[PDB]
Amino acid sequence: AMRISRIILXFLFLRKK
């Protein structure tokens, strides 16, 4: 499902959020 822009989200809830 175009998981290319959900790892930079999949990084967001991972940055500290």
Side-chain angles (χ1 to χ4, degrees):
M2 290 175 71
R3 208 220 178 189
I4 53 176
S5 297
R6 168 44 64 85
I7 325 88
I8 319 90
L9 263 310
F11 116 82
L12 262 315
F13 334 117
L14 299 190
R15 60 206 284 183
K16 70 101 93 178
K17 280 173 69 176

